[PDB]
Design an enzyme around this catalytic site. Structure first.
Site, short mmCIF file in Angstrom:
data_model
loop_
_atom_site.label_atom_id
_atom_site.label_comp_id
_atom_site.label_asym_id
_atom_site.label_seq_id
_atom_site.Cartn_x
_atom_site.Cartn_y
_atom_site.Cartn_z
N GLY A 21 0.76 -1.25 0.00
CA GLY A 21 0.00 0.00 0.00
C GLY A 21 0.80 1.31 0.00
O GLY A 21 0.40 2.27 -0.67
N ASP A 22 1.91 1.35 0.75
CA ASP A 22 2.68 2.57 0.94
C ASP A 22 4.15 2.26 0.77
O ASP A 22 4.92 2.39 1.70
CB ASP A 22 2.39 3.14 2.33
CG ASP A 22 3.02 4.53 2.57
OD1 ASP A 22 3.67 5.10 1.67
OD2 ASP A 22 2.84 5.07 3.69
N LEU A 23 4.52 1.81 -0.43
CA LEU A 23 5.92 1.56 -0.78
C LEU A 23 6.65 2.85 -1.14
O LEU A 23 6.12 3.73 -1.83
CB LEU A 23 6.06 0.58 -1.94
CG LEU A 23 5.92 -0.91 -1.63
CD1 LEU A 23 6.08 -1.68 -2.92
CD2 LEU A 23 6.96 -1.37 -0.61
N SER A 52 4.16 10.51 3.69
CA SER A 52 2.90 9.91 3.18
C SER A 52 1.69 10.76 3.55
O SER A 52 1.63 11.32 4.63
CB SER A 52 2.70 8.50 3.72
OG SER A 52 3.47 7.58 2.98
#
Lengths: 270, 265
Positions: free
Chosen positions: A112-114, B259
């Site tokens: 998901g969050d590479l 993020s």
């Protein structure tokens, strides 16, 4: 402060360093009530030299203490420090990165969050990488991988996340991120970059990016295999691991015959 | 237009040293490969060694001049690769009729210790406007073996048809087993309309052959499905021989990396 044969010593969020023996661990502290969901991915996933495991969890009155091996830096600072990586090194490191991702996808964990920051060196050697954390990955059921939670670092976001409503293939999205990684290790810049995130998204949507001339032929068309616009055209993480580049640096409209030897180093492949 | 011996030679742009030949007696249209006399003989060796067969293209005749040999060949009416593009996929009835001829060709070669080496749909051509009857177009670059031996190390061919063992092993490989894998790729592609492994980049395509993941869609029959999986086996020794393919039930059956919430855009 003591836990149980461990001194806790600060690091300023809720990670602190723990110390035995003279062994130095990292220690994430959660409130007991919510510790169990945090560690669920580690339980589902088999251990692997390039994924960071839980060492120990210890329970206290108010908090859970989850113990982790320590890292010696991350791949994002590595690339800033070293303007760009030589293919030999890039290949050595990027293969470990891909084995991590492949191994997750085989066990129905979508990342998901590479991003480069999520991969860390496991010794001062700084030859061996590991996925830092599973804290916010996605545990899937069998062969399914569709997800709609759109969260991540902008440089690594795939076009389909930006122009699709609803679900998207999370594995295919993960692979795009690996393409962004491979580009950025070899080149030294992101394939799409801007200071403003919405400006950056408008250039990912457009998809125009240039691979400079110094990149090898095999590395160039590995990059273009991963940064495909259509998600289904991209390679699987399992098949990235078998792509000629790595050994090289250690219906159609035409049925044209060629010298296969040129694409192949079975010697180095094993 | 130039004369040979009761033949007019007429160009064929796409084709390198092939030109069309035409009888001045009959109205008969042949194809004609020209070689320099010095190297003609090794080119035609396979045709000599192989007994004739309705599905292998024979030499009609060779004419010799001072500098060049002229080898004459029956004309084809299209190849099986364009056929499959033209026709999105073939119905099993047709696929079976045609694929059997393809396999009889290969089997017949293997019985005579000729390994093909470079099997692909393009190498099989219709012999009449009927376009019901195939023949192996050419033997120009096949491999003449000695008895029961078939080991070879060349590694040349069209990527979609290349077997995993060619990509994963060093040294020699069984050329007959490799030929059979190519037949599997053919059978898949005739029935499905796509290659079992496909990509525009060849190295990307090799990484999927290495992986070996391929899906036979639900519309394929049970007997055709296992014939495919009998030929596209990963271990070469598990694959069928071309002789035993011919007897398989199917045929009769038909700064900061931070993020964020991207949703906010």
């Amino acid at each position: 402060s003591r836990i149980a044969d461990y001194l806790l010593l600060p690091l300023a969020e809720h990670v602190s360093r723990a110390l035995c023996t003279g062994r130095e661990l990292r220690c994430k502290v959660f409130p007991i009530k919510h510790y169990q969901d945090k560690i669920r991915p580690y339980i589902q996933l088999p251990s692997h030299s390039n994924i960071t495991g839980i060492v120990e969890v210890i329970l206290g009155e108010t908090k859970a203490y989850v113990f982790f091996e320590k890292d010696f830096g991350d791949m994002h600072s590595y690339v800033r420090s070293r303007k760009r990586l030589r293919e030999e090194e890039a290949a050595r490191l990027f293969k470990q990165i891909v084995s991590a991702v492949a191994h997750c996808h085989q066990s129905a964990i979508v990342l998901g969050d590479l991003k480069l920051r999520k991969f860390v060196f496991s010794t001062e050697e700084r030859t061996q990488l590991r996925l830092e954390s599973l804290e916010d990955t996605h545990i899937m059921k069998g062969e399914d991988d569709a997800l709609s939670d759109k969260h991540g670092c902008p440089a690594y976001v795939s076009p389909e996340i930006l122009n699709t409503t609803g679900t998207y293939s999370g594995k295919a999205a993960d692979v795009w991120s690996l393409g962004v990684m491979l580009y950025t290790l070899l080149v030294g810049r992101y394939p799409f970059h801007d200071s403003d995130p919405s400006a950056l998204f408008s250039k990912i949507r457009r998809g125009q990016f240039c691979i400079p001339e110094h990149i090898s032929p095999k590395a160039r068309c590995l990059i273009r295999s991963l940064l495909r616009r259509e998600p289904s055209e991209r390679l699987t993480a399992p098949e990235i691991l078998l792509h000629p580049w790595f050994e090289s640096v250690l219906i159609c409209e035409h049925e044209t015959s060629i010298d296969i030897s040129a694409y192949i180093d079975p010697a180095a492949f094993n």
